[PDB]
Design a protein around this ligand. Structure first.
Ligand SMILES: Cc1ccccc1C(=O)c1sc(Nc2ccc(S(N)(=O)=O)cc2)nc1N
Length: 288
C-alpha cells in the first residue's frame, strides 16, 4: 500500500500475509491482511460487507476493504498480542481461572452476536483470538464460506467432528466446538486434540470422547466420510480430560463438546451456564 508504512510482518494469515502498518496520513496503527487473483469473487464481496458492519466489542473491527491491482487488502484495528503467545507466555504458571473465565465469557458474547446475525467464524484457534491490556479478547480473521498459500500447514486441532466427517454445511455449532477445545487448552496448558492429519485428528477425538454412534449422534453413520471400519473406542472418564477444572467448568465444556451439532450448546445458552455466576473482568499481565 502506497498509503501504508509496513512496520513488521505479524505472520502468514489464512489467505495471505499480515502486517502491522501505519496509515502514513492519519498515523493510525493497523493490522493489514494482503491477499493474492485472476477474477475475484462477488459472493465474497457481500460477506465482506456484512463483516464490515458486524461491529461488537469482542469482534476485531474491520476498518477498510481495498481491492486494487489484483490484490485485496483488509485493514483491521490493531491489537498487541494473540492468545497463542499469551498462553505460551503463561505456560509455567497457567492463566488464572478468573481470566480464563472472563475470556471464555467474552468470546461467547462475540459468538452469540455473530451467530444471531447468521455469521459463522469457521476457524477459531488461539492465533486468531486477540487480547489487549484492558482485559478484552476479540475474535479475528473470520473465515469465509468461499493456510496462506504454498509452504504451509493448516492446524486441525480445533476442527469440529462433523467437518472432519465431511458435512457439507457447517452450523454455528462448529464455532462452539473450537472454543471448547480452546477453553480446555487454557485450563490444562496442553492442546486437547493435537492431530497432525485429518484422520489422526478424528481418531484423537474418538479416543477421548468415544467413537460416536447412532445413540449419541443420530445420523453419524450416514455421513460422507464415516466408515464402519473406524475403530471403536470407549469414552474416557471426563475428570481425566481437564483436571483440575471444577465441575461447573467441566459441565459447560462437556456441553460444548457434544458430538451431535444439534445437542451442542449454543453461545447464548452457554452464557447462562452456572460456570459464569462469578465471572469478572481481570487485567492480564501483558509483556509487549
Ligand atoms: C488479519 C489477521 C489474520 C490472522 C490473525 C489475526 C488477524 C488480525 O486481525 C490481527 S493480528 C493483530 N496483531 C497481533 C499483534 C501481535 C501478535 S503476537 N504473535 O502475539 O506477537 C499477533 C497479532 N491485530 C489484528 N487485528
Amino acid at each position: 500500500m502506497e498509503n501504508f508504512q509496513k512496520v513488521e510482518k505479524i505472520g502468514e494469515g489464512t489467505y495471505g500475509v499480515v502486517y502491522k502498518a501505519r496509515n502514513k496520513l492519519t498515523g493510525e496503527v493497523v493490522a493489514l491482511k494482503k491477499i493474492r487473483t485472476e477474477g475475484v469473487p462477488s459472493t465474497a464481496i457481500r460477506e465482506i460487507s456484512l463483516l464490515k458492519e458486524l461491529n461488537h466489542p469482542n469482534i476485531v473491527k474491520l476498518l477498510d476493504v481495498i481491492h486494487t491491482e489484483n490484490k485485496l487488502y483488509l485493514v483491521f484495528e490493531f491489537l498487541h498480542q494473540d492468545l497463542k503467545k499469551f498462553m505460551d507466555a503463561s505456560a509455567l504458571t497457567g492463566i488464572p481461572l478468573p481470566l480464563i473465565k472472563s475470556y471464555l465469557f467474552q468470546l461467547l458474547q462475540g459468538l452469540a452476536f455473530c451467530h444471531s446475525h447468521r455469521v459463522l467464524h469457521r476457524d477459531l484457534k488461539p492465533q486468531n483470538l486477540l487480547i489487549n491490556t484492558e482485559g478484552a479478547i476479540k475474535l479475528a480473521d473470520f473465515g469465509l464460506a468461499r493456510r496462506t498459500y504454498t509452504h504451509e500447514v493448516v492446524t486441525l486441532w480445533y476442527r469440529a467432528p462433523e467437518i472432519l466427517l465431511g458435512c457439507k454445511y457447517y452450523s454455528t455449532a462448529v464455532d462452539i466446538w473450537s472454543l471448547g477445545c480452546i477453553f480446555a487448552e487454557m485450563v490444562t496448558r496442553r492442546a486437547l486434540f493435537p492431530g497432525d492429519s485429518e484422520i489422526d485428528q478424528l481418531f484423537r477425538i474418538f479416543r477421548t470422547l468415544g467413537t460416536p454412534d447412532e445413540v449419541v449422534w443420530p445420523g453419524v453413520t450416514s455421513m460422507p466420510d464415516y466408515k464402519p471400519s473406524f475403530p471403536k473406542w470407549a469414552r474416557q472418564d471426563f475428570s481425566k480430560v481437564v483436571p483440575p477444572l471444577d465441575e461447573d467448568g467441566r459441565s459447560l465444556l462437556s456441553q460444548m463438546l457434544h458430538y451431535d451439532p444439534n445437542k451442542r450448546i449454543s453461545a447464548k445458552a452457554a452464557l447462562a451456564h452456572p460456570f459464569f455466576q462469578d465471572v469478572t473482568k481481570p487485567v492480564p499481565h501483558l509483556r509487549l
